[PDB]
Amino acid sequence: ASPFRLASAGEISEVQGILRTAGLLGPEKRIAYLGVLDPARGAGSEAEDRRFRVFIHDVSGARPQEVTVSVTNGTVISAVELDTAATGELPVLEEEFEVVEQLLATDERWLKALAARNLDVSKVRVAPLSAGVFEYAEERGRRILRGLAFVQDFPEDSAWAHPVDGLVAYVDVVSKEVTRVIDTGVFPVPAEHGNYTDPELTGPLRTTQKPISITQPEGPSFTVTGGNHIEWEKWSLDVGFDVREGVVLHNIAFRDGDRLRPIINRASIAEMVVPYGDPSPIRSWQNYFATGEYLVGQYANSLELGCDCLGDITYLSPVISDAFGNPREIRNGICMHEEDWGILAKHSDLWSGINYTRRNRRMVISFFTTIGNYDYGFYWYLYLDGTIEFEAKATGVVFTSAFPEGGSDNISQLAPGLGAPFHQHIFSARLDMAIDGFTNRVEEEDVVRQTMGPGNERGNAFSRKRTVLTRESEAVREADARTGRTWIISNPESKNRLNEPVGYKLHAHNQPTLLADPGSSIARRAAFATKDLWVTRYADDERYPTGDFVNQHSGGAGLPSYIAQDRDIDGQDIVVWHTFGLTHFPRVEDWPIMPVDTVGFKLRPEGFFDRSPVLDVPAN
């Protein structure tokens, strides 16, 4: 009965039926996106009306549509025709992936380019890459995908070890036409294989690792009810899943005394982009929006016990729609478990003679997705002390290219003749705040150094300052590690026993943001990535920092346009959008399969509680 329950197979089938009945889902139609709509602010209808939103693609080219339906009433609430040439193309369909290689396989220009390289077409894999928006006039109003080739010597061969540089093709996946085939010259195809499961490369397997047994005799400390409602060590929340954003956390709250205190209404990674910094014409257009263009949730992996999730794990198997509206379950796509997290608090007192030690723990909610060569792990952590944290784990195989003989300033060499273009992995966390309720405000906190003089004769004093962001136009902030800059989200109407507004402090990793030139296509399409922190007034239709349609869409929507409304955010229903990412200069150690690298952020209570909230943790 929870209005925050996961989408069921039945609801998805019902959406399919409603669309069919409305004459909106004929045989030429495809569901590019389907997701449940969150309830509007303030308990509207007496009961909860379950609604879903869908992006309908048309394989014949007719205009696509955005439709919202009520599975409860079996009706179409609204259907609008989409002008893709203006608002953007629909997310890429998995069924379009193979279309690129297949079409090029019969194109004389492509075959000629391969022959010139002595490559057998039957062994050439082509990666279906999003196209973005550049200077190609013919692409206006065309659903395009670009292809980069990789040689696969045999069925189980890792094609990434064999990039075919100097070649790229543009394909219209709807009209089934190869618009362009660019060949800037023949580069040697890196010879070494990158098969990390081949003993020839792994050598004899280590026999030195002893087993580590992690078990919970009496079961986990958390409970799961209503299918996705979690309660663990004072925490309370609902675990949602969206085909686009993946795991989404709802109603994060903390039990303080006799009341459930809200902290975050909705938390998610609203976008993740991978911009490449190689100026070569073959890849200078490369910018992969995993979330917005491909929909990361769609590719969530089924997690194996013992391998992906170790210990006493509780799985959730979310359901998504396939391209035809049929429900598809992602078996064990979300795993949840608690784990020991070292020392929480400790003190040995020289005067009282009392020695005290308490261990910490954290609740883990995660999923792992795979998009082509990359694999990303998304982890949300809840700690005993009230800290909330997110961590992204990037691994998989690096996207490759040829390494020029004369060397490069935008590519690193991973093996003889094998290159790895520089790139970034930039995420955007959308945090719909609710610190003790919806009346919130954000304060930028900087360390303040003081000059030696009257009032500070020894020159030891240092302080800090807090600046309230009152309007959206002044809520676009940059990190400043040098001054220990953080952002506090507080509730001006809710004070702790010391008469201070309760709050939570956001700690960023302060990694470099988007490096692209500000006048580049990517700087516009990924504007959110140019600044560390954005604050907007909550609005039902402001969901992603890049807008609803990112594929082949120019700038104009997303965060920059939202902030333009310059709404009041001083003690209002606000949303924090935090940009964070990794700048990757591939190492030889990253080849042939890369070890995990991490990035993220966390929010710690700041005067939210009246004292430590973990004084009731048992000794043993």
Q: Scanning residues 270 to 309, which ones bind its own copies (CB under 8 A)?
A: 275-279, 284-287, 301, 304, 306-308
Element (H, E) at 103: helix 94-104
Residue ranges in 368-387 that form contacts with its own copies under rule CB under 8 A = 368, 370, 372-373, 375, 377, 384-386
610 binds its own copies per the rule CB under 8 A = yes
Per-position DSSP letters for 510-540, written without gaps between them: ------S-TTSHHHHHTGGGGSSEEEEE--T
Q: Of 318, 359, 348, 350, give the one whose Cα is nearest residue 335.
A: 318
Nearer to its own copies, 95 or 573 (CB): 95
Rounded to whole angstroms, how far apart are CA atoms 501 and 489? Answer: 10
Q: Which does 422 bind (CB under 5 to 8 A by kind): Cu ion, its own copies, none?
A: its own copies
Spell out, one character per residue from 580 to 619, where the chain touches Cu ion: x when CB under 5 A holds, - when not. ----x-----------------------------------
Binders of its own copies in range 589-608 (CB under 8 A): 589-596, 604-608
Give 448's Cβ-side CA count (13 Å radius). Answer: 8
| Residue 347 engages its own copies in binding (rule: CB under 8 A) | yes
Which residues inside 507-526 make contact with its own copies, applying CB under 8 A?
Answer: 510-512, 515-523
Here the tokens at position 475 are 């809520």
Shortest Cβ 139–its own copies spacing (Å): 15
For the CB of residue 616, give the shortest distance to its own copies in the complex, in Å.
5
73 binds its own copies (CB under 8 A): no
Q: Which stretch binds its own copies (CB under 8 A): 66-74, 113-121, 269-277, 540-548?
A: 269-277
DSSP letters, 329-382, are: E-TT-EEEEEEEEEEEEEEE-TTT--EEEEEEEEEEEEEEEEETTEEEEEEEEE
State residue 589 phi and psi, 5-degree precision: -65, -15
Per DSSP, the three-state class of 124 is strand
**Residue 450 binds: one of Cu ion, its own copies, none (C-beta under 5 to 8 A by kind):** its own copies
Token pair 């959008």 in the structure block, residue: 577
Window of 6-14, 69-77, 290-298, 456-464 that interacts with its own copies by CB under 8 A: 456-464
Q: Which is nearer to Cu ion, 117 or 584 (CB)?
A: 584
Nearest alpha-carbon partner for 67 in 119, 22, 127: 22
The answer to the question of residue 137 lying near its own copies (CB under 8 A) is no
Contact of residue 584 among its own copies, Cu ion, none (CB under 5-8 Å per partner type): Cu ion
**What distance in Å separates the CA atoms of residue 274 and residue 581, rounded to the nearest whole number?**
9
What's the CA gap between 388 and 431, in Å, rounded?
11
Which residue in the set 483, 494, 554, 572 belongs to the binding site for its own copies (CB under 8 A)?
483
DSSP 485-509: -EEEEEEEEEE-TTS-EEEEEEEE-
**Which partner from the list its own copies, Cu ion, none does 608 bind, CB cut-off 5 to 8 Å by kind?**
its own copies
Cβ-based nearer residue to its own copies, 23 or 618 = 618
The site map against its own copies for 77-116 (x = CB under 8 A) is: --------------------x-------------------
Radius of gyration of the chain (CA): 26
Residue ranges in 558-587 that form contacts with Cu ion under rule CB under 5 A? 584
Q: CA 366 to CA 528: how far, in whole Å?
A: 25
Any idea what DSSP says for residue 543? Answer: -
Write out the binding residues for its own copies, residues 522-581 only, by CB under 8 A: 522-523
To its own copies, the closest distance from the beta carbon of 142 in angstroms equals: 20
CB nearer to Cu ion: pick between 290 and 336: 290
Measured distance CA(166)–CA(401) in Å, rounded: 9
Q: What residue ranges bind Cu ion (CB under 5 A)? A: 584
